[PDB]
Amino acid sequence: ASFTCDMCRAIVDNVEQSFKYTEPTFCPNPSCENRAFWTLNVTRSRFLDWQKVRIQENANEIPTGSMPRTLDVILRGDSVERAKPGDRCKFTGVEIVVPDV
Amino acid sequence: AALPSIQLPVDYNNLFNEITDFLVTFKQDTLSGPKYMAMLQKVANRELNSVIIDLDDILQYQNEKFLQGTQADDLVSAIQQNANHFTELFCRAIDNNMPLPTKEIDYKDDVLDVILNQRRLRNERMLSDRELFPPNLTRRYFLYFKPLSQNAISSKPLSVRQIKGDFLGQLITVRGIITRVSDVKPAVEVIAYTCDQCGYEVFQEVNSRTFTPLSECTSEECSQNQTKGQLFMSTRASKFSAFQECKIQELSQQVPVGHIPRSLNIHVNGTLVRSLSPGDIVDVTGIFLPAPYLLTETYLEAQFVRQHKDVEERVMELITSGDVYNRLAKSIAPEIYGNLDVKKALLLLLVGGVDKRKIRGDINVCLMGDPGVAKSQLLKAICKISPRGVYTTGKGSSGVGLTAAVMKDPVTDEMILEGGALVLADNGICCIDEFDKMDESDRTAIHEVMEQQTISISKAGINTTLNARTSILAAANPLYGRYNPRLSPLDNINLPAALLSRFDILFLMLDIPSRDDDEKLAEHVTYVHMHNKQPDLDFTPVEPSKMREYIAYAKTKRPVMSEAVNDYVVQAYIRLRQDSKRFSFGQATPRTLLGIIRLSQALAKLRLADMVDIDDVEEALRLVRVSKESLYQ
Amino acid sequence: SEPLRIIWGTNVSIQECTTNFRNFLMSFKYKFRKILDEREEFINNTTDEELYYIKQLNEMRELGTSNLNLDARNLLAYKQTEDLYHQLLNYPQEVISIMDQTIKDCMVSLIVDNNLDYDLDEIETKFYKVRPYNVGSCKGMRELNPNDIDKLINLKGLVLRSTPVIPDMKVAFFKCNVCDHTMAVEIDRGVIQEPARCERIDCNEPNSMSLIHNRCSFADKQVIKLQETPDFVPDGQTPHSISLCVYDELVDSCRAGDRIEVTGTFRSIPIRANSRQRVLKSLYKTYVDVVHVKKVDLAKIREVAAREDLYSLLARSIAPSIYELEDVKKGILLQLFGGTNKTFRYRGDINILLCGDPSTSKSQILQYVHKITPRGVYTSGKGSSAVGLTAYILVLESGALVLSDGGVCCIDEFDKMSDSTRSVLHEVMEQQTISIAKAGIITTLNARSSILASANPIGSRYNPNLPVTENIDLPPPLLSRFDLVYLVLDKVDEKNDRELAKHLTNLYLEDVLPVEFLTMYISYAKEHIHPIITEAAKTELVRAYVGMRKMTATTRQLESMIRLAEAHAKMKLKNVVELEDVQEAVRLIRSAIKD
DNA sequence: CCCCCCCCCCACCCCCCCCCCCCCCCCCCCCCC
DNA sequence: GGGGGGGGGGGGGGGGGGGGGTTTGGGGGGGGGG
Ligand SMILES: [Zn+2]
Ligand SMILES: [Zn+2]
Ligand SMILES: [Zn+2]
Question: B456: closest CA among C193, C522, C41, C399?
């Protein structure tokens, strides 16, 4: 992300994002006083194509035909929109925690 | 926020002195140490925790003092007026006067003793110039006021809608039905916090439905050292009290015409918990109180409860009189005319056969044919006489039903699995009225009783079979209002013959118009209406509770097989097979043979024998023969 | 002159507690338990003189597994540890911490005493758990009260359902926004002990540390709703239920419908009035925090496999209480064996229909077979819906037949079942899967069940002057789905009726028969015996089908013969099909196909 | 066997928090002994 | 040459202000009657 300060038109850039939409804490300009008042420069900021897909336990593998277990999966970039509902897929990637943002 | 103040006609110093005077003086002297001090020695031994105060004791003490010419300031009125405060006064008096224990306790095993001893040691280390606790923490007992007898407002049982706002603070007594009961949960009397940075624990008492936890160590050990230590709650050291809530509703009869039935929350604490259950009709004494919601929420703090509702020698009183099977069968619904062979079979279903390993021991009977003839009353009477009985109908009992299921409590949001009537009848007997009308799930439920002695669940991820070992009594009243009294029952009844084949016996009975038998029945009915007593002479009708002695006693006289019965019952099956060499579905089968064996075993139980008798087989065959000849019509 | 480690609130020395437990964890002999309890007459040196928990620790080290299961009564047998049982029951968290650390310490002690080549680094890496159990009386769920609130308890109950696995942070990971230095913090009683300033003295910036969520380290937690059983309730009112927390590899140790014991510390916690506030509600939530769970060989198998009467021996064992009917019992025994499978469709199933009168014992045979099989189901066909039997509607849930995937499905009253439901069972018998397509739900739901139908002639009796098709009233090709079809009839005969009555009445006299060995033998056969077909079987298969085809038959009979011959070849652990297997499969079919 | 019914499922005060201001403490520098 | 006192910076505490906290219709599935 990239932001411009509300009281001086300096620009912060390459702000790494947590699971929350994250804004700068200090203004880079020592002549400026600001903490936490920003406008996002859309054209300078960088976005990724993103798509959540939910999976459930495979039909032949459920131990006795009971309710399957479920998991949330995140696709990004060129991997988005390759999967489909009802499709049976193999994934690779990282198991991760996600906080209640 | 400044407050005004007013003078009032009371003094809690004077009344505290009166309360401790009563406590250290009174006994029930009309019945000829003090009652209360002796009871507090029982508390000190940790043998008792429920401290009960009788308002009648307070009244007797007041009358004794007034008789001795000094005014007692009517403590009964004060406790009936502002009851909640006098719990605190009575408990303080007890804490100021309770004697030391007599029985040994292994005193160090209580954490409160160790922690308060350690605090005392630490305080002595300080006190060398180098309260100890909030009293509710140390107070182990629970104190309750018990109302005045008839001889005053606490004595009167109020219906719920008579509980008006002016009663708030008074020790009233309420009457109604409990419509709901909570599961028990603990509530904090005193929270104990450890302090991480000094080890000096600190305490917060809780006196509301909510509280906010402590953070910084307020103790002088930290505060004088200006050491801002952090506090952590300990469930080991915190005093919890048992809490439970129950919703009471006024009786359905008390509701004025058109009004909704009014209801109230009862809160109950300490040892008095789980004294109530749903469907109880009960009188409850308690303090009627507000709670934070100007409109207050309100509840009743329960204090005292009044529910509305040897043998092995005593059975000999009937045994010694003789012919007890015939007489006990004649004692089954004596207001119902005749049909003694049917009653004699219905008794054996309560007594039961043998189960062995499996071998299946329950005994079942179907009544069939024309409606009426006091049959539903007979099934209800069996449900009354028999222990572990339940009455149903093929479409009735339409709440939890005869057939089981997974369920929610949709008035709230939780889910639960609960049994139907066939599980309540487990280890007992189930009576199915309107048996002809039950549906496919009901029919498969009784199938599973007969075929597995269970009822099955296969829903919401739960597969389970619940236990349903039970005798069936059943009533297959026919289609189209009347049976055609020369045909097979399958031309008259809805049910499949497969189900009917599982019953040990079937009695088809027809409501024949026939002047002579009509007059015999009518003479019985009119005599019962005329005389109001002894539905027939020489029947010797035993009362229900007394015969339950013998039914329970007979049920446990399990028999052992005799070679005579082994041969005789093989012969009996072969004899009935000759009749089977064919004009109706009463054929001899292994299941009729098992029915004869179980009926015979129930007769062996009733004659209190170990060796089963060929007489038992022949009489079991006689009931089957009467059953088949009935079915043959 | 020294500090003392004390279990807080108790005056128990932790060092003495540790030694008192260590000296039992080693040097305990299982004979001491037989001195404590009943069955003291059955002390046996070669099973009781071992240093029993060192035997456990050595097997545990070879397997490299973290858990030591510990019956609590064993603590009372050993003299130095009797007090420690009471300390455990009253202060379980601290005593269990001591026992865990002592197990790890003893693993080190054993490898250094033996100066073994096993990795010290592995033992040091490994966490070790004690799982104490059999604490005492399984007091009722309804009976728990405030005195229990820190004690170890043990509850019997029914699992209603469970959560998915829930991540529980055990170590937080903090990275400096200024200098990128990283540090780790163990979570203390659910509180992150956040560093207020950066650790590095050359940076030491305040509030500069931030939590890197996915570099924190997490334990596993799961919550399960455990119900009071409907057996134990005062039956006029509802059963209770209690939440339990279960952790790490104890996650998913049980499932919905499991009746279990759980041993754990009883616990209570406050719950917030509003998550935006510290304010707590006065009455605490309660839960049990579990430390152990429990539900509710080949040498013997080889010895039986050599017997000559083994066909009849296994056949009698399925239902010795019922009349011997041994063609039915032999056919069912082949249904329990099953055939084999080939993935290129066909399945190694076997399917049977018990016809005959309603006045006969076939339902009881079905009941015993439903008990014998590992994963079967029982139901009946009258009024049985095509969707209720199979799968029903948001989510689709499996019905009785699908729940019997991989086991016998017993269905009584089968002759009364509607043609629609039979039309669903067509693709069970043909494909062993259900090809659903409804609003939102499309699926081929696999359900590999060996159906055992029980059926009747239409009306009260079988007509002996008619064939089985004309009697049963179900159409011939439906009967041709099944492998074997049988008549069991109530017809009067004083010889059979005497011997049956004797056979039945003998049950009350007496004080491979048992089902436990039968189901074990069938299971071991399924694990080990997968017969291939020899040419001596091929020749009779082709010939016998061509025979009954010009008796007038179909290849479904031939496929039935193949599956039965493979099932027959699972007897005597034979593992190869030959002529005799085909002959008996064909012969039993000749008893059936006569119609 | 076919069609209709009916059942299900779904759409003003008090606490936490943050910002601002003032005082106190601790270090550095200079002078005095 | 070391220790005290004066002066300036930096941090912590305390106070003050502010914001947040069930009926009606429709389709499809499932079961019952003509
Ligand atoms: Zn700026
Ligand atoms: Zn402290
Ligand atoms: Zn840093």
Answer: C399
Report the DSSP beta bridge partners of residue B291: B297
Q: Which ligand is nearest to the CA of A31?
A: 1
- In the beta sheet, which residues pair with residue B514? none
- Going by their DSSP bridges, the two strands B281-291 and B297-307 should be labelled as antiparallel
Sign of the Cα pseudo-torsion (B56, B60, B65, B70, in order)? positive
Check if the beta carbon of residue B391 is closer than 8 Å to that of residue B438.
no
CA distances from C545 to C552, C557, C576 (A): 10, 7, 21
Handedness of CA C354, C433, A72, C438 (dihedral sign): negative
Q: Other C-beta atoms within 10 Å of C53: how many? A: 21
> Which tokens in the block code for residue B201?
């624990």
How many residues does this entry show for chain C? 595
Shortest CA–C1' contact from C276: which nucleotide? D16
Q: What does DSSP say about strands B389-393 and B428-433: parallel, antiparallel, or unpaired? A: parallel
Helix, strand, coil percent content, chain C, rounded in steps of 5: 40, 25, 40
How far apart (Å, rounded) are the C-alpha atoms in residues B36 and B42?
Answer: 10
Residues 6+ apart with CB under 8 A from B339: B509
CATH of the domain at B465: 3.40.50.300
B505-508 β-sheet, strand order: B389-393, B428-433, B470-476, B365-368, B505-508
List chain A residues with CB under 8 Å of B463.
64
Q: Which of C164, C218, C398 has its CB closest to that of A97?
A: C218
Are both C43 and C102 inside the same structural domain? yes
CA distance B159 to chain C (A): 25
Name the residue among C131, C165, C589 with its Cα closest to residue C350: C589
The resolution, in Å, is: 3.2
Under 8 Å between Cβ of B430 and B422: yes
> C150 and C222 in one domain?
yes
Bridge partners, residue C379, by sequence:
C411
Return the percent helix, strand and coil in chain A, to nearest 5: 5, 20, 75
Contact B307/C at CB under 8 A: no
Nearest Cα to Cα of residue C78 among C57, C96, C52, C59: C52
Instruction: Please give the protein residue whose CA is closest to the C1' of the nucleotide E27.
Output: C439
- Indicate if C163 and C228 belong to the same structural domain: yes
The structure's method of determination equals: cryo-EM
Instruction: For strands B50-54 and B142-146, give the pairing.
Output: parallel
Ligand nearest to the CA of C208: 3
Domain containing residue B467: 310-627
Query: What count of residues does chain A have?
Result: 101
Query: Does one domain contain both C126 and C39?
Result: yes
> C173 and C131, same structural domain?
no
Which residue's entry shows tokens 């505060």? B223
**What is the b/e burial string over B613-623, where b = at least 16 CB atoms within 10 angstroms of the residue's CB?**
bbbbbbbbbeb
Distance from CA of C321 to the nearest CA of A (A): 31
Q: How far is B459 from chain A (nearest CA, A)?
A: 10
Same domain, C72 and C210: no
Angle, CA B353 vertex, CA B348 and CA B359 arms, to 5°: 150
State whether the beta carbon of C388 lies below 7 angstroms from any atom of strand E. yes
What is the DSSP annotation of C351-364?
Answer: -EEE-S-TTSTHHH
Q: How far, in Å, from the CA of B202 to the mean position of ligand 2?
A: 8
Q: How far is CA C294 from CA B238, C69, C253, C267, in A?
A: 32, 11, 9, 20
Q: Which of B440, B448, B571 to mutate to test binding with chain C, by most C CBs within 10 Å of its CB? A: B440
Q: What does each C-alpha distance from B110 to B114, B237, B394, C74 come to in angstroms?
A: 7, 10, 57, 25
Q: Which residues form the domain of C159?
A: 138-296
Residue tagged 């009167």 (tokens): B156
Q: Can you tell me whether residue C147 is helix, strand or coil?
A: helix
Q: Tokens 């004869």 label which residue?
A: B596
